[PDB]
Symmetry: C2
Subunit: 76 residues, 2 copies
């Protein structure tokens, strides 16, 4: 089977608030992107995908949708 | 603290699933901290670090979704 992928969203620094998982959820479903799970963290958000393809599609969507000051990284 | 899972499913074939972001909205609006949300084909699983948080979320989601949904608290082994 396919290898799952993780999208990590963190603020670039202090002054920028934690990414809102409600907004992230909205932007992913608005673009028809399906994720496996969302895990809120102290200063960040982890989103799991069933594939790296979905993760990458979510990265280009959240890159444009999320306001300035967020680090969006795709992981294995 | 043994982890807890909240399972939300429609009572039957026909009833859809509410937009998953609405559940997120209702939990944060009531200051409920959850560990994770896992969307399923016909459902939703929410993990909690404890059964106390899970129970608080069940009461909150029970009032946000008063009809057509099975909300069940499950305790992890």
């Amino acid at each position: 089977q396919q290898q799952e992928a993780t999208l990590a969203i963190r603020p670039v620094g202090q002054g920028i608030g934690m990414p809102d998982g409600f907004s992230v959820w909205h932007h992913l479903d608005a673009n028809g992107i399906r994720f496996k799970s969302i895990t809120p963290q102290k200063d960040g958000l982890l989103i799991k995908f069933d594939s790296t393809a979905q993760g990458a599609a979510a990265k280009e969507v959240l890159g444009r949708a999320l306001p300035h000051g967020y680090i969006i990284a795709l992981l294995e």
